[PDB]
Design a protein around this ligand. Structure first.
Ligand code: MG
Length: 327
């Protein structure tokens, strides 16, 4: 059939992005086929419909476009309950942490996400430590390093570890590293390569055990008004391709992409070194992490949020979905 509704999906990443190739393309297919063509989905990567990434959330909410994919934290401070997912050593895999974020958001973020229909609230694959020169084999080795963290809480963690955290827009990264304003940065492996950093930051440190350094919360968000305008027999087609199992899948795609990057470095296909810290060393980093958690909880309480309850629920959910997947 001819399209009754055309859903324009807008995001910042290139069409070659794993999520675009492996999630949005099949999402588009399923929506179109299951609606018998009544729903068309048009994909616009690389900000091809205009603006910059901090404007995406409002582009969907305001109905300029129908669906967006974005980082909540691009509007820093806008989603204060979501920030719990930025804490050090909270996440496990992108897949399981994603499923946990979705459920957390459905429980706690109904007002924070008012006006969007959440196709998937998820996280990216957990990040790692990337430096030009310093092989980080112990906590002591990060002391004094100029490191760009990708969130407030990761920068706070960096400062507790004794690094000097430096805030700047993401586009300034490659160049601040090359200019020597920065020693390194904290981001996933897929982001290192896509940013043109794979030959600049050739030392990479990851950790032992069933928790990883950090992630942040992302969303595939539809204008609630557009969802509400769809007929009763088409809304369920969207519902069938929305929710926590979609979030899991997005996270898993991002996990697979980061794993391929690690394999490439380990094989020699890409240059550099991957250092994994042992268990006991990793515990020292987690102990510092716990200080950031405790500070976040206190600050949240001071502002009227039940921070302890939220942290406890985020961590409960991460454990739930990690265990379910391991089985
Ligand atoms: Mg709206």
């Amino acid at each position: 059939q001819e399209a009754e509704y055309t859903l324009r999906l807008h995001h910042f990443f290139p069409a070659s992005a794993p999520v675009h190739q492996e999630y949005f393309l099949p999402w588009k297919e399923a929506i179109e086929k299951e609606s018998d063509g009544r729903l068309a989905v048009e994909l616009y990567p690389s900000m091809q419909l205009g603006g910059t990434p901090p404007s995406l959330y409002d582009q969907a909410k305001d109905g300029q476009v129908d669906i967006i994919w974005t980082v909540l934290g691009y509007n820093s401070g806008r989603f204060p309950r979501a920030e719990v997912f930025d804490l050090p050593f909270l996440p496990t895999s992108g897949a399981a942490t994603s499923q946990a974020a979705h459920e957390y958001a459905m429980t706690h973020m109904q007002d924070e996400l008012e006006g969007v229909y959440p196709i998937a609230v998820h996280t990216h694959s957990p990040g790692a430590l990337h430096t030009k020169e310093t092989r980080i084999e112990a906590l002591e080795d990060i002391e004094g390093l100029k490191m760009r963290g990708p969130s407030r809480l990761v920068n706070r963690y960096l400062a507790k570890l004794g690094a000097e955290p430096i805030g700047m827009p993401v586009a300034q990264a490659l160049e601040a590293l090359s200019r020597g304003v920065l020693d390194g940065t904290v981001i996933p492996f897929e982001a290192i390569t896509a940013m043109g950093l794979a030959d600049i930051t050739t030392e990479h440190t990851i950790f032992s055990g069933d928790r990883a350094l950090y992630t942040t919360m992302m969303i595939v968000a539809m204008d609630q008004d557009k969802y509400d305008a769809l007929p009763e027999d088409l809304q369920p087609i969207i519902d069938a391709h929305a929710g926590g199992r979609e979030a899991y899948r997005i996270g898993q795609i991002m996990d697979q992409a980061d794993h391929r990057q690690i394999l490439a470095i380990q094989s020699g296909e890409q240059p550099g070194t991957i250092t994994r810290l042992g268990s006991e060393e990793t515990a020292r980093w987690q102990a510092v992490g716990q200080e950031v958690v405790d500070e976040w909880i206190a600050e949240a309480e001071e502002k009227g949020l039940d921070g302890q309850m939220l942290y406890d629920d985020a961590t409960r959910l991460v454990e739930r979905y990690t265990r379910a997947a391991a089985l």
